[PDB]
Amino acid sequence: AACNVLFINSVEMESLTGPQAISKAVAETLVADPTPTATIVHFKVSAQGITLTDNQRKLFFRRHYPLNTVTFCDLDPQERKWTKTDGSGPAKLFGFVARKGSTTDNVCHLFAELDPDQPAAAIVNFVSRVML
């Protein structure tokens, strides 16, 4: 299945992981300078993992995260929101932690819900059931 969401930022977490990693990535993202520029992306969940593709204007073209590299996915533990460099109000933040040549190093990829019928909690639950 594929959902439409806003890709917000990717943060190097070293060995941090789990909810601590998601929360830390959110904190770093909200004070990043300049403010990261969000991009509308196709967030596809499959037996192969998570594949992100442009559904905006090609910032990046495509990124694929093999299922075995995804170790965690959840909403921001502190329930902070993304105020899109735009308007339409605050959007809930969520992300996933991926290991992927750094064995113990992780990266957290952050997103914001965009479609009312595809809320962050539902996306997190689907990824969890299929990949974690």
Side-chain angles (χ1 to χ4, degrees):
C3 320
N4 265 308
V5 300
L6 289 170
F7 164 73
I8 306 299
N9 192 31
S10 293
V11 188
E12 295 279 342
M13 315 306 300
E14 282 213 323
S15 67
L16 233 58
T17 193
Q20 182 180 196
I22 301 300
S23 186
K24 181 68 178 179
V26 169
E28 291 187 48
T29 296
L30 295 176
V31 298
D33 178 0
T35 303
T37 54
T39 292
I40 295 166
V41 302
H42 190 67
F43 189 106
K44 179 178 163 182
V45 173
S46 73
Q48 287 64 57
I50 297 299
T51 307
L52 310 178
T53 59
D54 188 275
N55 281 246
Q56 182 81 282
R57 288 192 164 179
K58 312 66 192 293
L59 170 164
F60 61 74
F61 165 49
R62 176 174 173 248
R63 292 171 175 170
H64 175 65
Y65 300 93
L67 190 146
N68 79 296
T69 68
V70 181
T71 63
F72 196 67
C73 179
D74 210 348
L75 307 167
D76 172 21
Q78 297 188 266
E79 305 188 282
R80 292 161 291 191
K81 302 193 206 315
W82 173 258
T83 55
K84 322 88 159 299
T85 57
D86 198 329
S88 81
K92 281 190 186 60
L93 287 159
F94 72 95
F96 67 87
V97 178
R99 297 159 173 165
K100 175 72 179 182
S102 52
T103 51
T104 32
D105 274 343
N106 300 297
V107 176
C108 178
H109 297 101
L110 295 177
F111 308 78
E113 59 188 0
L114 185 63
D115 191 317
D117 292 329
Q118 301 176 180
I123 297 29
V124 165
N125 174 272
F126 191 64
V127 168
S128 296
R129 281 298 219 163
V130 171
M131 307 180 44
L132 305 174

